[PDB]
């Protein structure tokens, strides 16, 4: 129902006025974001302990809380900062340190230091790899006239955004390479649609495909050797795969129907995609070495835009169920579907590399904004807003 109760104490700050960042706020919000933890409200804390020994287990047990996060933040002549946390047991081992660490970071990595604490605590208590130091990429339509579309990247939680690319035409569907160093996207900069790959550090741009008609929807294979995308030069959209070492392209689908929005399975062999071949969009699957695709979505009237988990256990998608469209999960072994979001005009979902969260676009006014839903359905939140309309969120791999 609500996530496992946990106490996050405001981190101890030694110095000038107020701390430069609320490290324990970051740690609380992250843990809340995963759906897994219900951090006790800061106002409701029984004690603001500043280290592992200043923690009173009784106080915490009494509230159903078996772990407390405390930390410290100190400054360094060098303009840098020391950030430390201790995860203390208040359950079976009252007063025991379960995890702890120490960083030296510049002010600009304070959020990062909070996210490292989050990741470490998260993983110790759940045994699941933390995803709080991973980013998202998306397209923003701004109010600027000349370059209204802006391929951007930020931290999964909205902070620290930067611009990768500005365009006078539209940009669509960004995709991360599995090492997180490149993004693939559709650009219309030419007058026509084209698929490029951009190195983030560099800005270097590799041209991938520009055939007649349509070129879109990229997905990098998990092993890093391929790029799947859709092309409609035959007459309808069909799936193609490119060998990145050679530049060589295969046709994966043939079909008078439209086949688009490829997504990989963990084996870099199979893809799930969307096809209208059955009328209203449905999710299908196919091997890149051929064979016929198989439908895999029988729940609801329409299912499109899939994202398969990194372990291949499930998939998220845009689904029309009970007469409307939301983000929903399909257990790939059992077959069950769960509706996750409850906002309006839910599009483009993307999974976090540990499968605990989904980022998606939703409709608000004449504009788009970004939403985050835990994969268990418990936690829903809108991200900080920005200066224009936001579409096409892509969650990065671990970084």
């Amino acid at each position: 129902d609500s996530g496992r109760p946990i106490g996050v104490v405001p981190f101890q700050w030694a110095g000038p006025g107020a701390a430069p960042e609320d490290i324990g706020g970051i740690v609380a919000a992250d843990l809340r974001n995963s759906g897994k933890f219900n951090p006790l409200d800061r106002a409701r804390l029984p004690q603001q302990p500043g280290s592992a020994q200043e923690v009173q287990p009784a106080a915490w047990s009494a509230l159903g809380i078996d772990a407390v996060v405390v930390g410290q933040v100190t400054p360094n002549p060098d303009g840098s900062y020391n950030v430390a946390y201790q995860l203390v047991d208040t359950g079976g081992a009252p007063g025991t340190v379960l995890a702890q660490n120490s960083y030296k970071v510049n002010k600009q990595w304070l959020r990062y230091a909070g996210h490292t604490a989050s990741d470490e605590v998260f993983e110790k208590l759940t045994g699941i790899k933390g995803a709080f130091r991973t980013r998202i990429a998306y397209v923003v339509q701004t109010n600027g006239g000349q370059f209204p579309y802006e391929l951007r990247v930020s931290d999964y939680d909205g902070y620290n955004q930067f611009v990768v690319h500005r365009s006078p035409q539209p940009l669509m569907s960004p995709a991360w390479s599995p090492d997180g160093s490149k993004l693939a996207y559709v650009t219309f900069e030419s007058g026509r649609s084209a698929l490029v790959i951009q190195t983030l550090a560099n800005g270097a741009v590799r041209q991938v495909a520009s055939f007649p008609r349509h070129n879109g929807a990229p997905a990098f294979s998990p092993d890093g050797s391929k790029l799947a995308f859709a092309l409609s030069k035959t007459g309808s959209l069909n799936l193609y795969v490119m060998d990145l070492a050679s530049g060589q392209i295969r046709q994966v689908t043939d079909g008078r129907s439209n086949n688009t929005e490829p997504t990989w399975f963990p084996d870099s062999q199979n893809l799930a995609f969307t096809s209208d071949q059955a009328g209203r969009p449905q999710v299908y699957k196919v091997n890149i070495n051929g064979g016929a695709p198989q439908r895999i979505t029988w729940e609801g009237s329409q299912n499109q835009d899939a994202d398969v988990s990194s372990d291949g256990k499930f998939m998220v998608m845009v689904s029309s169920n009970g007469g409307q469209q939301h983000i929903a999960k399909q257990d790939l072994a059992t077959g069950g579907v769960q509706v996750l979001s409850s906002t309006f005009l839910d599009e483009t979902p993307s999974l976090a590399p540990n499968g605990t969260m989904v980022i998606y676009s939703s409709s608000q006014g004449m504009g788009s904004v970004l939403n985050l839903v835990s994969t268990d359905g418990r936690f829903k939140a809108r991200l900080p807003a920005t200066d224009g309309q936001v579409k096409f969120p892509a969650w990065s791999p671990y970084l």
Partner: peptide, 12 residues
């Protein structure tokens, strides 16, 4: 500017 499906993430 789109893929000309009317259904996809990439229509317009």
């Amino acid at each position: 500017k789109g893929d000309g499906t009317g259904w996809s993430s990439e229509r317009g």
